[PDB]
Write an enzyme that holds these catalytic residues in place. Structure first.
Site, PDB file in Angstrom:
ATOM      1  N   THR A 157     -21.155  -1.503   8.314  1.00  0.00           N
ATOM      2  CA  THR A 157     -20.420  -0.440   8.895  1.00  0.00           C
ATOM      3  C   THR A 157     -21.117   0.947   8.603  1.00  0.00           C
ATOM      4  O   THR A 157     -21.438   1.178   7.450  1.00  0.00           O
ATOM      5  CB  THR A 157     -18.941  -0.540   8.801  1.00  0.00           C
ATOM      6  OG1 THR A 157     -18.526  -0.543   7.708  1.00  0.00           O
ATOM      7  CG2 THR A 157     -18.308  -2.039   9.518  1.00  0.00           C
ATOM      8  N   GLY A 169     -19.536   4.013   9.390  1.00  0.00           N
ATOM      9  CA  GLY A 169     -18.632   5.154   9.816  1.00  0.00           C
ATOM     10  C   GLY A 169     -18.831   5.666  11.266  1.00  0.00           C
ATOM     11  O   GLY A 169     -18.458   4.850  12.166  1.00  0.00           O
ATOM     12  N   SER A 208      -6.979  16.072  -9.919  1.00  0.00           N
ATOM     13  CA  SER A 208      -5.446  15.629  -9.611  1.00  0.00           C
ATOM     14  C   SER A 208      -5.234  16.530  -8.177  1.00  0.00           C
ATOM     15  O   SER A 208      -5.039  17.667  -8.059  1.00  0.00           O
ATOM     16  CB  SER A 208      -4.493  16.290 -10.542  1.00  0.00           C
ATOM     17  OG  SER A 208      -3.226  16.222 -10.264  1.00  0.00           O
ATOM     18  N   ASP A 248       0.827  -1.216   0.093  1.00  0.00           N
ATOM     19  CA  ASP A 248       0.086   0.036  -0.125  1.00  0.00           C
ATOM     20  C   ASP A 248       1.005   1.465   0.056  1.00  0.00           C
ATOM     21  O   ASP A 248       1.797   1.283   0.742  1.00  0.00           O
ATOM     22  CB  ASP A 248      -0.710   0.157   1.265  1.00  0.00           C
ATOM     23  CG  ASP A 248      -2.083  -0.885   1.333  1.00  0.00           C
ATOM     24  OD1 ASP A 248      -1.941  -1.776   0.386  1.00  0.00           O
ATOM     25  OD2 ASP A 248      -2.499  -1.092   2.338  1.00  0.00           O
ATOM     26  N   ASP A 261     -11.202  -3.995   7.242  1.00  0.00           N
ATOM     27  CA  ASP A 261     -10.735  -5.133   7.499  1.00  0.00           C
ATOM     28  C   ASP A 261     -10.657  -5.397   8.804  1.00  0.00           C
ATOM     29  O   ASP A 261     -10.870  -6.587   9.461  1.00  0.00           O
ATOM     30  CB  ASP A 261      -9.478  -5.317   6.612  1.00  0.00           C
ATOM     31  CG  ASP A 261      -9.641  -4.968   5.356  1.00  0.00           C
ATOM     32  OD1 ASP A 261     -10.625  -5.189   4.621  1.00  0.00           O
ATOM     33  OD2 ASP A 261      -8.467  -4.410   4.711  1.00  0.00           O
TER      34      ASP A 261
HETATM   35  N1  LIG Z   1      -9.529  -3.108  -5.739  1.00  0.00           N
HETATM   36  C1  LIG Z   1      -8.981  -3.846  -4.747  1.00  0.00           C
HETATM   37  N2  LIG Z   1      -8.705  -5.028  -4.703  1.00  0.00           N
HETATM   38  C2  LIG Z   1      -8.146  -5.632  -3.860  1.00  0.00           C
HETATM   39  N3  LIG Z   1      -7.730  -4.985  -2.519  1.00  0.00           N
HETATM   40  C3  LIG Z   1      -7.897  -3.697  -2.458  1.00  0.00           C
HETATM   41  C4  LIG Z   1      -8.434  -2.949  -3.701  1.00  0.00           C
HETATM   42  N4  LIG Z   1      -8.442  -1.875  -2.913  1.00  0.00           N
HETATM   43  C5  LIG Z   1      -8.016  -1.882  -1.902  1.00  0.00           C
HETATM   44  N5  LIG Z   1      -7.371  -3.141  -1.552  1.00  0.00           N
HETATM   45  C6  LIG Z   1      -6.707  -3.553  -0.205  1.00  0.00           C
HETATM   46  O1  LIG Z   1      -7.934  -3.087   0.600  1.00  0.00           O
HETATM   47  C7  LIG Z   1      -7.251  -1.950   1.617  1.00  0.00           C
HETATM   48  C8  LIG Z   1      -7.857  -2.437   2.955  1.00  0.00           C
HETATM   49  O2  LIG Z   1      -9.196  -2.689   2.842  1.00  0.00           O
HETATM   50  C9  LIG Z   1      -5.768  -2.126   1.235  1.00  0.00           C
HETATM   51  O3  LIG Z   1      -4.840  -2.741   2.211  1.00  0.00           O
HETATM   52  C10 LIG Z   1      -5.631  -2.613  -0.421  1.00  0.00           C
HETATM   53  O4  LIG Z   1      -4.329  -3.270  -0.288  1.00  0.00           O
HETATM   54  N1  LIG Z   2      -1.154  18.550  -8.922  1.00  0.00           N
HETATM   55  C1  LIG Z   2      -0.381  18.798 -10.033  1.00  0.00           C
HETATM   56  N2  LIG Z   2       0.726  19.670 -10.048  1.00  0.00           N
HETATM   57  C2  LIG Z   2       1.581  19.694 -11.031  1.00  0.00           C
HETATM   58  N3  LIG Z   2       1.546  18.852 -12.147  1.00  0.00           N
HETATM   59  C3  LIG Z   2       0.663  18.035 -12.393  1.00  0.00           C
HETATM   60  C4  LIG Z   2      -0.485  18.053 -11.204  1.00  0.00           C
HETATM   61  N4  LIG Z   2      -1.346  16.912 -11.861  1.00  0.00           N
HETATM   62  C5  LIG Z   2      -0.774  16.570 -12.846  1.00  0.00           C
HETATM   63  N5  LIG Z   2       0.112  17.355 -13.200  1.00  0.00           N
HETATM   64  C6  LIG Z   2       0.969  16.947 -14.284  1.00  0.00           C
HETATM   65  O1  LIG Z   2       0.241  17.533 -15.159  1.00  0.00           O
HETATM   66  C7  LIG Z   2      -0.133  16.313 -16.362  1.00  0.00           C
HETATM   67  C8  LIG Z   2      -0.282  16.964 -17.649  1.00  0.00           C
HETATM   68  O2  LIG Z   2      -1.111  18.101 -17.728  1.00  0.00           O
HETATM   69  C9  LIG Z   2       0.766  15.289 -16.008  1.00  0.00           C
HETATM   70  O3  LIG Z   2       2.014  15.231 -17.070  1.00  0.00           O
HETATM   71  C10 LIG Z   2       1.275  15.747 -14.771  1.00  0.00           C
HETATM   72  O4  LIG Z   2       2.699  15.374 -14.620  1.00  0.00           O
END
Ligand SMILES: Nc1ncnc2c1ncn2[C@@H]1O[C@@H](CO)[C@@H](O)[C@H]1O
Ligand SMILES: Nc1ncnc2c1ncn2[C@@H]1O[C@@H](CO)[C@@H](O)[C@H]1O
Lengths: 329, 329
Positions: free
Chosen positions: A228, A230, A41, A17, A262
């Site tokens: 659950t 929250g 982003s 993770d 979990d």
């Molecule tokens: N799409 C997924 N499939 C399997 N495991 C996941 C996914 N998303 C998160 N996890 C696992 O579940 C989390 C805990 O519930 C994390 O430890 C992560 O590794």
């Molecule tokens: N929060 C951010 N700050 C700066 N650059 C970013 C961010 N999110 C995405 N990018 C850059 O912008 C994208 C293109 O527009 C990617 O190439 C990524 O590296």
């Protein structure tokens, strides 16, 4: 099934993770016109790596709590170190499939100021879990009292459930993390005959949204729904209606919500395995849950049967505390 | 500013992009009750690494198009290889700050079947961009005709804008990727006096949402608003009202939308730098944009002045095509 008995088998993912923190609010950035097509982003503050995977997390907690537990999932060659970490808490790792070619799965998660989470999961070796046969696990260790079907390779989730169905093994449907990837047909075929169905309330609504099912349709197929809620604790529902509710154990900090689900599941099932009623099992679950919430990572909490009693007493009264602490080590 | 003239200076991030594909729909998983607090995890199909950063992407495209361009941002020691890649397309990398201790920024992005995107950005070395002085860049290369203020270290975005303000340099406000992290106060102080304000329509609404500004408040402070509109092309607005609109160049594939915005901006500014009108500049922009859409990664497209003319003709007519191809190499 007239084969010999013996354990909880935890199926589901094994991963690394990468947990990050967004020092803002996702909701505040989520415009409801633009939800047709998001463009998000988040500049994060922090990036940290921990052992993970739903099966890794659940198996770890059962082990900490002193339960007999077998971890069943697929990992990369890199697994040897993670294995040692699990074995140290009494986890049987014999039935972990180690890929010859693929890397252990990678989870990349961003948590915001309100404990909302947005994440990607790259399967890598997890995809090979479809090649694991529970029949071979049962052959070696006997019939477990319960198999947990956690988020995993989508095909494996179904194959494992079918194997439990034909082997007559009790199973817990815990599709949580995979509900986003799975089609309504794929979710529907995981539920019938489950001893437990575990989700949070969001996932519960997502399940019913994607299945086309009403709550009544689900309750007819399962022995217990565990949802659950929250900060509002947890609902335990029965075939049609009876509902036990347990409120949370008040937290000292909201550090990291990863693996809280979990942990609750592991504590609750450990409780159930020890002859505790549904209410008492959920109270123990709620404590493991808060211990995870108060630590970074999913497996970085501790056990300390003295502090456990104290906290359980403070939230649920000293009858609860004494009943839970007793049926353990 | 009586200092000597000379170029487009591109400020903004320099990163490594990890691009993944979710073979489903984000919107379908985004429940509008649960938007208070999301709980999302997408099992992805694919994971691939490419050169990135808004400044990297924009500088690259200007270079490909034959423009004189200086890249101004902060990177890790790992930058030497990326530098060679940029220099090969004529990018001046002299003013890249190389961190003694920190790693080049990491972008982790998941794209769904509808080209929606959800991503995290780990700054690493980017945070040191606040230590770059544009005054030193101007000293060495002369006054650029334009400085682009792309998504960067939040503090750097403002310091760079202030430096342009006091040095009397024309600048393009291009906060796009950082609008989620920046407070309304932080966005407001980037806009006044901008030659161009670039965003997409979502970011435009996000900007106005977080600033507390009306469109009129913004148009009073800038020379031109450029708002890309996804499949509906782009709006070019003037002080108060005049609006030129250019529709997209029809795509052959929707491969990967990462860097489409950066590409449009680079083409458009290259067009503007070559004396092309707003309409013709946006048409050239739209072509670079589609070339990025049709490739994986942001800098993995090609130039081929023959195919460019052909495509421009097909979408905008042969007057447009001939006018654009001419003012170039
Ligand atoms: N799409 C997924 N499939 C399997 N495991 C996941 C996914 N998303 C998160 N996890 C696992 O579940 C989390 C805990 O519930 C994390 O430890 C992560 O590794
Ligand atoms: N929060 C951010 N700050 C700066 N650059 C970013 C961010 N999110 C995405 N990018 C850059 O912008 C994208 C293109 O527009 C990617 O190439 C990524 O590296």
């Amino acid at each position: 099934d007239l084969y010999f008995q013996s354990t909880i088998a935890v199926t589901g993912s094994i991963a690394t993770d990468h947990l990050m923190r967004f020092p803002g609010r996702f909701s505040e950035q989520l415009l409801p016109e633009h939800l047709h097509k998001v463009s998000l982003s988040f500049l994060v503050d922090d990036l940290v790596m921990h052992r993970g995977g739903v099966a890794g997390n659940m198996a770890f907690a059962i082990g900490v709590l002193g339960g007999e537990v077998a971890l069943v999932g697929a990992a990369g060659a890199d697994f040897a170190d993670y294995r040692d970490w699990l074995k140290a808490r009494g986890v049987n790792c014999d039935h972990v499939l180690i890929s010859e070619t693929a890397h252990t799965a990678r989870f990349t998660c961003t948590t915001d100021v309100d404990m909302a989470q947005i994440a990607s999961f790259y399967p890598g070796a997890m995809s090979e879990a479809r090649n694991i046969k529970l029949a071979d696990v049962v052959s070696a260790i006997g019939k477990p009292e319960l198999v947990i079907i956690g988020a995993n390779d989508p095909e494996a989730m179904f194959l494992h459930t079918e194997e439990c169905r034909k082997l007559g093994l009790a199973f817990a449907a815990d599709p949580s993390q995979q509900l986003a990837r799975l089609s309504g047909e794929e979710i529907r075929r995981l539920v019938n005959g489950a001893a437990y169905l575990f989700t949070n309330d969001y996932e519960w609504d997502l399940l019913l949204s994607k299945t086309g099912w009403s709550e009544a349709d689900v309750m007819a197929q399962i022995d217990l729904r565990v949802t659950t809620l929250g900060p509002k604790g947890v609902d335990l529902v029965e075939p049609d209606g009876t509902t036990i509710h347990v409120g949370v154990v008040p937290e000292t900090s909201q550090t990291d919500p990863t693996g809280v689900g979990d942990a609750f599941r592991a504590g609750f099932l450990t409780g159930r395995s020890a002859g505790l009623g549904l209410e008492r099992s959920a109270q123990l679950g709620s404590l493991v849950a808060v211990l995870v919430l108060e630590s970074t990572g999913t497996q970085e909490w501790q056990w300390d049967y003295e502090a456990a009693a104290s906290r359980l007493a403070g939230a649920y009264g000293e009858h609860a505390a004494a009943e839970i602490v007793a049926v353990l080590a």
